[PDB]
Structures are given as structure tokens and as C-alpha cells.
Amino acid sequence: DFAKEYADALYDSLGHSVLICDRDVYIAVSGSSKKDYLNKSISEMLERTMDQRSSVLESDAKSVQLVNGIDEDMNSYTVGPIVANGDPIGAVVIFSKDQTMGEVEHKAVETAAGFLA
Amino acid sequence: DFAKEYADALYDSLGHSVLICDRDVYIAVSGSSKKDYLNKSISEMLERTMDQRSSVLESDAKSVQLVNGIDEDMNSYTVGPIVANGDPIGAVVIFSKDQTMGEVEHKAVETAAGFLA
């Protein structure tokens, strides 16, 4: 499991929850409960972020939907769409309920997305 | 080439020269000339860093040896030893002649090293 390995490496290094999705669902979860995210449908926010192809960083999110329709209290998050041959095929998400995502995590998701693509 | 793919992803995302070595030589080079680094013997600094297992960040290096005996003018660099089963098997290096390596790159090498291990 290639996405799982990367998610684990990101968690081990950065210490924040890591999700990786394909076009539909989360396919890798590290740092968070697999029950909460694995195979769950990605949110409209994730879909839009992937469609827009650019990475995003929200330093003061307050609340976010990672799973569609599921409002979650969230301090911050960052998303790196995985774009292969111009087509979004997934995304890498790093988030925290209590810590602030910064350029470290923002670049981490871009790097992860680039490698996974 | 797995190390090459990661080095390329790191270069694409962070925009700095990236080297990956095994215990002996550089095995992947991105952002810099392959002639300057590929198959070149790693420096004593690299060997010591790997032996000590911890990542390092030098924000004001002035000069560094990446290739053994080769003094290179360098603004800054960061090194993430690749440690598998307690044994150092290589390292990921990000460096710049003109820009300052910070936590972004420092964590990038740790993440890279963790994944490659």
C-alpha cells in the first residue's frame, strides 16, 4: 500500500493527521482513526480543491468538512491535489484540531502529491 | 528509479537542489548537474551525519563538503539520514547556494528519509 506508506511517513515526521484520497474516498489514514475516514466519501471542499488543482492552506479553519456533509471542528488544514497528466486523481490532506498548519505541512502535501502523481 | 522519483518531486515542489545517497555515493540528483554529484563519494560530513542518525539543518553554512574533500560555497543545507531497522542506509540532502533552508526543507528531508527507509 503505497499511499499508506507515505501517509505513515508524513505522520511519523510531522505528527499531524494525514489523509490521502482518490477521486472518491479516503484510501489512506495516518494519525487519525481509520474508522473516522477510511472509505468515507470526500467532501465537496476536497472535490473543488482537486478540480482547482492548486494546493490550499487554511491556518484558521474553525470548521471543515473532510468527509462530505460532516462538519468537523478544525484548527487548520492543508490540501495538495494529486494531478497526473493534467487530471486530478486524488489529494493529500494534513490537518490538526489543535495545531496550526504552516508552510512545512503545505509544502509537504505538495511534495507528497507530486511524488504520488 | 525510486530515489530519483522522490528527488524530482522534492525539486519540483521546493525548488532546491536535492541529493540522495546510499552508504557510499550519490544515487539521485535533482536540480543540480548529475555530473557534479551522481556516483560521487559522499563527504565525511555526510558519513558522520548518517552515523549520528539525527537530521541536521545548517542555515548559514558558508561552505560545505557534499562530495568528500570538495569544499563548496553553500548558503545552507539540510540532511535527513535514511535509517532502516536502526541502520543508516543513506541520506536525503537539500541545499542551496543562495537561499536559506528552513523547517520546510528540514522536515522534507526527514519525511523523505522516513518514506525511503
UniProtKB/Swiss-Prot annotation, chains A, B:
Residues 1-117 are annotated as: GAF-like. GO terms for molecular function: DNA binding; identical protein binding. Disruption phenotype: Deletion of the gene leads to aberrantly formed spores. Mutant spores release their dipicolinic acid (DPA) via germinant receptor (GR)-dependent germination more rapidly than wild-type spores. Spores are also more sensitive to UV radiation and outgrow slowly. Keywords: Activator, DNA-binding, Repressor, Sporulation, Transcription, Transcription regulation. Induction: Expression is regulated by the sporulation transcription factor sigma G. The keyword DNA-binding applies. GO terms for biological process: sporulation resulting in formation of a cellular spore. The keyword Transcription applies. Homotetramer. Two monomers dimerize via their N-terminal swapped-hairpin domains. These dimers further associate into tetramers through helical interactions between their C-terminal GAF-like domains. Transcriptional factor that positively regulates or negatively the expression of a large number of forespore-specific sigma G-dependent genes. May provide a mechanism of feedback control that is important for forespore development. SpoVT levels during spore formation have a major impact on the germination and the resistance of the resultant spores. To B.subtilis AbrB and Abh. The N-terminal domain binds DNA non-specifically and the C-terminal GAF-like domain is crucial to its correct folding and function. The non-specific DNA-binding activity of the N-terminal domain is modulated by the C-terminal domain, which perhaps in combination with another unknown factor, confers activity and specificity. This is Stage V sporulation protein T. The lineage of its organism: Bacteria, Bacillati, Bacillota, Bacilli, Bacillales. The chain holds residues 57 to 173 of 178 of the full protein.
